[PDB]
Amino acid sequence: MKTRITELLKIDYPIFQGGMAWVADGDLAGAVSKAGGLGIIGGGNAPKEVVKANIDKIKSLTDKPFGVNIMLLSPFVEDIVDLVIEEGVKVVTTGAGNPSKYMERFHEAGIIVIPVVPSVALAKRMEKIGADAVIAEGMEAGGHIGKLTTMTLVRQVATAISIPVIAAGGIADGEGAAAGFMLGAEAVQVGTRFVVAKESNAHPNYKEKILKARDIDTTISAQHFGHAVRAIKNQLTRDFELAEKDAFKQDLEIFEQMGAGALAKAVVHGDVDGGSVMAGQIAGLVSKEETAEEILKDLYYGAAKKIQEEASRWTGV
């Protein structure tokens, strides 16, 4: 099997392990890339020397292609742009910001550029400015979310643009992967499930929170401030929502002191009470710690089996 994504990126599986701040370090990304998917380092708000450490690590683990996810509103964005070009990174994905500032520079260096998009208008603009592909990420995803769901966003984006679309948000098995393809995506991006990979350095407490999570255990915080974040319910989200209910009755320092280094606390130190346990709605389905390779194969061969089984049921229609 081939897709425009497998062919453009020269990878065996049409599966990205999503760039994730703190979680997506060299070890995790390396494991995914070695296994045949696209590992992606989460640049987040890390300065150059930190991101370089992860790139050094991945290059020591595998020679296969990998991505770096750049957060464009990072105070260190200019350094991270330098770094990926300096290091010969094959693929860049970008969060919310303005990739147009960097597009020609990336392309003059030979980098493939794949912005994350929350809307049809944004996907069309990304295509217009020369993006090689886009990731359509549903609001069910972990982390900073838009408003459209994977079902409706992926379908509408795939219809609107000619460049390949990668479905992200809510995918944690072969069935979910296959659905993504049915909507018109040519690859899938998986986040939540990769956090519990054996090669993931997410604290055991963070992984445990995902493993034990029910379907209904995520919530959206900070929606009223225009910075909606999806995470597993805990003391932080409760205290945050309590303070939001308060604020809607009327001071924003209480929120940024509540949120300051929240993700790091959880991922690195396993403070899953006071930290931010970002994860998607599909956390409910994620129930086993497995190797990155095992996850990739389950996603890929699970998709294949489901598609073949369903094709059999639908033959002659």
Ligand X SMILES: Cc1cc2nc3c(=O)[nH]c(=O)nc-3n(C[C@H](O)[C@H](O)[C@H](O)COP(=O)(O)O)c2cc1C
Annotated binding site for FMN: 19, 21, 69, 137, 142, 170, 189, 191-192
Among 9, 15, 84, 168, binds ligand X (CB under 6 A): 168
Q: Which is nearer to Ca ion, 80 or 153 (CB)?
A: 153
Among 75, 108, 162, 216, binds its own copies (CB under 8 A): 216
> Is residue 314 a contact point for its own copies (CB under 8 A)?
yes
Give the residue ranges of the annotated binding site.
19, 21, 69, 137, 142, 144, 158, 161, 170, 189, 191-192, 201
In whole angstroms, give the CA distance from residue 72 to residue 216: 31
Q: Which is nearer to ligand X, 39 or 280 (CB)?
A: 280
Q: Tell which residue, 39, 88, 41, has the closest CA to residue 62.
A: 39
Mutual angle of helices 292-314 and 26-35, in 10-degree steps: 40
Which stretches of the chain are assigned E, i.e. beta strand? 15-17, 39-42, 66-70, 91-94, 112-117, 134-137, 143-144, 165-168, 187-190, 218-221, 229-232
Among 62, 201, 205, 219, binds Ca ion (CB under 5 A): 201
> Is residue 18 a contact point for ligand X (CB under 6 A)?
yes
> Is residue 223 a contact point for Ca ion (CB under 5 A)?
no
**Between 100 and 139, how does the x/- string for binding to ligand X read (CB under 6 A)?**
----------------x--------------------x--
**86 in Cβ contact with 68 (< 8 Å):** no
Q: Concatenated DSSP letters for 121-146?
A: HHHHHHHHTT-S-EEEE-TTSSEE--
In the list Ca ion, ligand X, its own copies, none, the entry touching 278 (Cβ below 5 to 8 angstroms by class) is ligand X
Query: What's the Rg (C-alpha) of the chain?
Result: 19
In the list ligand X, its own copies, Ca ion, none, the entry touching 201 (Cβ below 5 to 8 angstroms by class) is Ca ion
